[PDB]
Write a protein that binds this ligand. Structure first.
Ligand code: CLA
Ligand code: CLA
Ligand code: CLA
Ligand code: CLA
Ligand code: CLA
Ligand code: CLA
Ligand code: A86
Ligand code: A86
Ligand code: A86
Ligand code: KC2
Ligand code: DD6
Lengths: 224, 225, 228
């Protein structure tokens, strides 16, 4: 609801609560009521925070080291991590993006999410509900959220505190990852760091150069 | 305070008094803050002109380059001495001052501390205490404070507090006049100045040049001044 | 009704001057359209002219000093230092067309009855508030935030504060009209106003012709620029 967002923001920060200069809590840009917009915005914020904090940890890990499994060193020797991503095989990037899309279409589907006992976030579900992976006859050893258990005995208040902590952590980590990408692309952007370097090509581009693909890889005429 | 000085009275040549209460409170707070900042600036300028260079910068201060604190101090008074610091140092100092100003202007902390209307309105000059409950909860307990960090003013009468506030206002006005005169004497002018007082960087209200992003402005050469 | 409101508004604009209508324009029936509609049209024209004059004054200062937004966009074609009349001389011709088209879109939204009845109010020539821009709850696709108050800074002010704001808006608009035409008069005839003599250079083109010096056909677009 509209009143719940100010309470959640005050729980996240008591000094500054309900900070929306752009408002955005009344723009019904889906035409499905005010609650649907609030649920979409909360889910987008939480997803962006999770992805951004995981990307920050991954950039910190892969900016210095690699994984010794199967010739994963020539790709790690491609300067910046974004150039390493652009230097990965086409099948690798395709399967990674399709894997993430499979997780997204599993989470958003409001019949598997109904098997977990909740609903879609635009229809009253909680913001961020990647559910248990028990829907098909293919026995999975571990699920997505809490893979090696260790969270069954958690309390409701502890869950709410952890949710607020994760929201604030992603709130910081989105700006952190954006600053890392900006310093990678345009030097002198991040004034508190001068160590990260090398170009990223186009940072918002999954396919580049060696990616052949069925046409439409017109990397010519780029922008800033 | 109607008049601390009995031979002066209410001096309002521009008619700024007899206005809305918010404007009067803002003017009083601006006077108090300008006086305090000018007294601190005059003390710091006198200390820098005398020579108080810190025996410091043992690794990590320059940032891989070779820039010692005494090297920054060996340029003058407020002048090329203040204008020779690195861009990160000036930016972080201005950011810390802005964080202090935004904490002072925060109405939630003022209302929790028992103060009055914000933007330094009711009870002007009051800096909220940065400790205890509903403030700075995430680590950073702040063992020191902003005002009375050593408890030097634990007990004071309200009449003594009002007298000290009037003395602070008068001393801050005198220190603002003295700081403006000292900047002028650095630039020349005034009565017979002497005492060297070095040269002047830019003109009086010098800023933090030699930066990047918005500092490519050669416009500071004219505009009369 | 409308005339008495004009008398009152002129009183609070300047109590010394008051109602100053030498050329009797508050009595001419323009399109055979009564008194109140004519008064509403005149007030709306005055307020629109004043707002455009204020925005043009600030934009003239920004262009003459040099205040380019950034890269890639239409500021790349305009030379570094050209004076304000020449920044509407080197932007692309399609950029001028689309700027004037968006201004016309805003005018059409301002007088569309469907946009205006969504807020419960009528035309300024039919008993509305002159100079009022409507909200955007009639578009077809939802707009993030409206034009008058883009953020919610307003809407808590008293109606008396709104009336004082309207009076200040009208007075500042008239003064900005005078200032902007002082700029334009110095740019054409030397020594028109005394203070700006030698500050603003001379211009040769026509100020009333939007597309007499047509801009270049430069297509500033990358990534998918299939339209040549
Ligand atoms: C694309 C990412 C994204 C998205 C979808 C949202 C979405 C939202 N934010 Mg948000 N926020 C973000 C990034 C994002 N935020 C970042 C990076 C910051 C830090 C600069 C903030 C700081 C922030 C504050 C301070 C507040 C929100 C609030 C809100 C809500 C209105 C809405 C759920 C408000 C809320 O909780 O409701 C609120 O008070 N956001
Ligand atoms: C086949 C690929 C695929 C597909 C179909 C989707 C589908 C969707 N994504 Mg998504 N996403 C993908 C790959 C994909 N994603 C990848 C590789 C990333 C980077 C890790 C993301 C990062 C991402 C974010 C950060 C967000 C989405 C959101 C969304 C939803 C809009 C929709 C369900 C948004 C969403 O669900 O908001 C409610 C949202 O905020 N996605
Ligand atoms: C307006 C306030 C102000 C400002 C902008 C500065 C600015 C600076 N001080 Mg400073 N200082 C101040 C007040 C101030 N000080 C006060 C009130 C004192 C106590 C009397 C000092 C004592 C002080 C010392 C002891 C030193 C500085 C130094 C410096 C420089 C680093 C920089 C130019 C250092 C320096 O190298 O000076 C150039 C240094 O060693 N300051
Ligand atoms: C600590 C905060 C901080 C500070 C002081 C600056 C400071 C600056 N940034 Mg910056 N920036 C920051 C965070 C910060 N940035 C973050 C988090 C991002 C990512 C969203 C960016 C993205 C960014 C870009 C994209 C650009 C700057 C630019 C600039 C410079 C103007 C200036 C030095 C500009 C610059 O000088 O780059 C050449 C510029 O183009 N910044
Ligand atoms: C195009 C802009 C414009 C418009 C549409 C209006 C409209 C209006 N003004 Mg207004 N005004 C303007 C600019 C404008 N004003 C400027 C720049 C000033 C400052 C000098 C004023 C100062 C002013 C006062 C003090 C008062 C008004 C009032 C009024 C209202 C009725 C009076 C009237 O006859 O109209 C104004 C007349 C015209 C706009 C004439 C039409 C233009 C003619 C045809 C062209 C003349 C050009 C010519 C070269 C000028 C010679 C100047 C010099 C040699 C004398 C009406 C809503 C009255 C009011 O408060 O009601 C709300 C009132 O008392 N006006
Ligand atoms: C001598 C006759 C006379 C009289 C009695 C008035 C009376 C009035 N004028 Mg007015 N005016 C006059 C002549 C007169 N004016 C002339 C000759 C001009 C043309 C220059 C103006 C231009 C003018 C404007 C543009 C406005 C008024 C406004 C007002 C009203 C309120 C202003 C106020 O209280 O705070 C205002 C007092 C100030 C000191 C303003 C603060 C300083 C500004 C914001 C910054 C400008 C600085 C700038 C860099 C200078 C260059 C008041 C009824 C205002 C109004 O309608 O309010 C109801 C309004 O917006 N007047
Ligand atoms: C009780 C219970 O159930 O178990 C608990 C504990 C337990 C097991 C751990 C849990 C878990 C799971 C996990 C894996 C939790 C970990 C999550 C993770 C990985 C969280 C990353 C955050 C990354 C951040 C904040 C990055 C900030 C980044 C920042 C702030 C910046 O970069 C800013 C900055 O760059 C600028 C802009 C300029 C620079 O010059 C300066 C710096 C660098 C400052 C549970 C289940 O959740 C809860
Ligand atoms: C192994 C290694 O590398 O370790 C490193 C660590 C480290 C730290 C990097 C090193 C260093 C150097 C150090 C210690 C550098 C730190 C220098 C420091 C800490 C400098 C403070 C300035 C404070 C100022 C200017 C305050 C002004 C504020 C003033 C003048 C105000 O009046 C504030 C005001 O609020 C009032 C009071 C009232 C308000 O109404 C109004 C305002 C807001 C205006 C070394 C030596 O390299 C070693
Ligand atoms: C002898 C000789 O030559 O003398 C010369 C001298 C000189 C100087 C050369 C000359 C000139 C030029 C002049 C005088 C030019 C004047 C230009 C002028 C008068 C320009 C107005 C701008 C107003 C704006 C942009 C309003 C913004 C308004 C804004 C942004 C808002 O709406 C905000 C706000 O409303 C909300 C949303 C809610 C309110 O609660 C609060 C406020 C109000 C903040 C002359 C005329 O040639 C004569
Ligand atoms: C170029 C753009 C522009 C400029 C430079 C400008 C300047 C000023 C100034 C400073 C001089 C003041 C003080 C002022 C104040 C008010 N403006 Mg203006 N304004 C601009 C644009 C609009 C638009 C689009 C609208 C609008 C309105 C109002 C109302 C509401 C009255 C009410 O709610 O009764 C008030 C109080 C709205 C309206 O209702 O106009 C009848 C409306 O839609 N304004 N405005
Ligand atoms: C490349 C490609 C193609 C393509 C394409 C596409 C889709 C090209 C699209 C280009 C596009 C979509 C260009 C939009 C510009 C929008 C602008 C400038 C809006 C400014 C909007 C502004 C300045 C709004 C301002 C304000 O709203 C604010 C912020 C607050 C309000 O209160 C007030 C107003 C309203 C004033 C092909 C060829 C078709 C197919 C091919 O396969 C792939």
């Amino acid at each position: 609801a509209m009143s719940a967002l100010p309470e959640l923001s005050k729980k996240l920060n008591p000094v500054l609560g309900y900070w929306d200069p752009l408002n955005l809590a009344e723009l019904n840009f889906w035409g499905a009521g005010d609650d649907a917009t609030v649920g979409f915005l909360r889910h987008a914020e939480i997803k962006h925070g999770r992805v951004a904090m995981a990307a920050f940890v991954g950039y910190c890990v892969q900016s210095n080291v690699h994984f010794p499994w199967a010739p994963f060193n020539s790709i790690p020797t491609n300067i910046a991590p974004a150039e390493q991503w652009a230097q990965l095989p086409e099948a690798a990037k395709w399967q990674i993006i399709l894997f993430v899309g499979f997780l997204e279409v599993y989470s958003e589907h409001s019949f598997i999410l109904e098997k977990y006992g909740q609903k879609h976030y635009m229809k009253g579900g909680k913001p961020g509900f990647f559910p248990d992976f028990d829907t098909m006859v293919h026995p999975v050893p571990l699920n997505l959220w809490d893979p090696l258990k260790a969270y069954k005995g958690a309390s409701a208040e502890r869950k709410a505190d952890g949710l607020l902590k994760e929201v604030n952590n992603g709130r910081l980590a989105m700006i952190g990852i954006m600053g890392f990408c900006a310093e990678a692309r345009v030097p002198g952007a991040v004034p508190a760091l001068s160590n990260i370097a090398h170009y990223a090509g186009d940072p918002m581009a999954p396919f580049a150069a060696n990616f052949h693909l069925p046409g439409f890889a017109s990397x010519x005429x780029x922008x800033x | 305070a109607k008049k601390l000085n009995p031979t002066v009275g209410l001096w309002d040549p521009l008619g700024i008094a007899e206005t809305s209460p918010e404007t009067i409170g803002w003017f009083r707070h601006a006077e108090i803050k300008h006086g305090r900042v000018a007294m601190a600036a005059f003390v710091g300028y006198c200390v820098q002109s005398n020579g108080i260079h810190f025996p410091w910068n043992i690794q990590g201060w320059q940032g891989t380059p070779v820039v010692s604190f005494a090297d920054i101090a060996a340029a003058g008074g407020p002048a090329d001495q203040w204008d020779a610091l690195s861009t990160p140092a000036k930016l972080q100092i201005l950011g810390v001052i802005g964080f202090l100003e935004m904490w002072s202007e925060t109405s939630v902390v003022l209302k929790a501390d028992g103060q009055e209307h914000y933007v330094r309105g009711g009870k002007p000059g009051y800096f909220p205490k940065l400790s205890r409950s509903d403030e700075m909860a995430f680590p950073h307990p702040v063992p020191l404070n902003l005002w009375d960090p050593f408890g030097f003013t634990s007990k004071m009468t309200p009449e003594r507090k009002e007298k000290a506030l009037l003395a602070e206002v008068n001393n801050g006005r005198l220190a603002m006049i003295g700081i403006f005169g000292m900047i002028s004497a650095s630039k020349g002018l005034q009565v017979p100045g002497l005492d060297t007082v070095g040269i002047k960087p830019y003109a009086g209200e010098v800023m933090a040049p030699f930066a990047a992003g918005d500092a490519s402005l050669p416009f500071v050469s004219g505009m009369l001044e | 009704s409308a005339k008495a409101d004009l008398e009152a508004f002129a009183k609070e604009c300047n109590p010394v001057v008051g109602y100053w209508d030498p050329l009797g324009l508050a009595d001419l029936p323009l399109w055979g359209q009564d008194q109140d509609a004519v008064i509403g049209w005149l007030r709306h024209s005055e307020i629109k002219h004043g707002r455009i004059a204020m925005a043009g004054f600030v934009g003239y200062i920004a262009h003459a000093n040099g205040f380019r937004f950034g890269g890639i966009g239409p500021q790349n074609v305009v030379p570094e230092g050209a004076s304000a009349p020449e920044v509407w001389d080197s932007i692309p011709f399609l950029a001028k067309l689309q700027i004037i088209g968006a201004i016309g879109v805003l005018e059409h939204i301002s007088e569309d009855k469907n946009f205006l009845a969504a807020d419960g109010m009528k035309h300024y020539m039919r008993g509305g508030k002159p100079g009022y821009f409507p909200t955007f709850s009639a578009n077809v696709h939802p707009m993030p935030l409206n034009l008058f108050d883009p953020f919610k800074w307003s809407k808590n002010a008293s109606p008396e504060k709104k009336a004082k704001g309207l009076v200040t808006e009208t007075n500042n608009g008239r003064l900005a009209m005078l200032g902007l035409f002082g700029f334009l008069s110095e740019s054409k005839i030397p020594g028109s106003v005394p203070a700006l003599s030698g500050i603003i250079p001379s211009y040769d083109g026509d100020y009333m012709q939007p597309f007499l010096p047509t801009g270049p056909d430069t297509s500033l677009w990358t990534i998918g620029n299939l339209w040549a």
